[PDB]
Design a binder for this molecule. Structure first.
Ligand code: NAG
Length: 261
């Protein structure tokens, strides 16, 4: 399967929806699903990485590389100085590392490294972005396009600029694929900058717990109450798969059989 592209400089809600549908369709294991929700593959599947090319209104691009099995961003590349410049997180090493480097920038064309001197965990990114919480960093289509312009092809840019771009891209691409609720936040705020609400953050932080609960659910009942948060930050108690299913687009891989429909 090849590169999925999203044009943030010429986007519409329908194009963003199509993009999410393509990302989910290529990331999901061809057959795993629980309660009708597609699940990502185990660590030894057919295709290991997905490339997602984002284009800004400047026409410049940034391509993210996602580990297909869990959708984490491994790094990104940008066309720079007539070379392919690859930026990989500092905890990616060995095989994986050279696999990421070569997938972003094939050894048959000019290339150059520009390390990401930190890892991709949210607290790390928030620290580099200079915020106590990513809910202080606005998301949005125009913001994504602008961040692409600030980095792509640029010989110089700060870690703060890069970490903010990463906070935006991670949440508008893989988190939105994982959660229809997040995709929907982008679609209902399509023409404006917006701060992610408490439910967005809570879903991002509990994807594994939510995926395990749905996978382990019997006749639609979660193993035990699942405590999350409503959009306004208040406590939300979920007892059944159907109460949370509307918000979920992809399940993290959970071993073993499950009620598939
Ligand atoms: C995964 O599940 C199968 C299918 O039930 C089981 O044979 C295997 O023990 C499990 N793997 C792990 C690590 O628990």
């Amino acid at each position: 399967i090849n590169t999925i592209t999203f044009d943030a400089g010429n986007a519409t809600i329908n194009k963003y929806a199509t993009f999410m549908e393509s990302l989910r369709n290529e990331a999901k294991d061809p057959s795993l699903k629980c309660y009708g929700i597609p699940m990502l593959p185990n660590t030894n599947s057919t295709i290991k990485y997905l490339l997602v090319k984002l284009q800004g209104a400047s026409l410049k691009t940034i391509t993210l590389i996602l580990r297909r099995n869990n959708l984490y961003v491994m790094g990104y590349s940008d066309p720079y100085d007539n070379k392919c410049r690859y930026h990989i997180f500092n905890d990616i090493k060995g095989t994986e590392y050279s696999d990421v480097e070569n997938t972003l920038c094939p050894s048959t064309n000019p290339r150059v490294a520009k390390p990401i001197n930190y890892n991709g965990l949210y607290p790390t990114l928030e620290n580099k972005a200079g915020v106590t919480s990513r809910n202080q960093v606005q998301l949005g289509i125009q913001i994504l396009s602008s961040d692409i312009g600030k980095i792509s092809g640029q010989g110089s840019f700060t870690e703060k600029t890069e970490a903010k771009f990463l906070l935006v891209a991670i949440q508008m691409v893989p988190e939105a694929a994982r959660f229809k609720y997040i995709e929907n936040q982008v679609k209902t705020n399509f023409n404006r900058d917006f701060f992610p609400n408490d439910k967005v953050l809570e879903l991002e932080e509990n994807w594994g717990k939510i995926s395990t609960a749905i996978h382990d659910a019997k006749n639609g009942a979660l193993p035990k109450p699942l405590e999350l948060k409503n959009a306004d930050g208040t406590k939300w108690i979920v007892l059944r798969v159907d109460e949370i299913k509307p918000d979920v687009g992809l399940l993290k891989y959970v071993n073993g059989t499950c009620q598939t429909t």
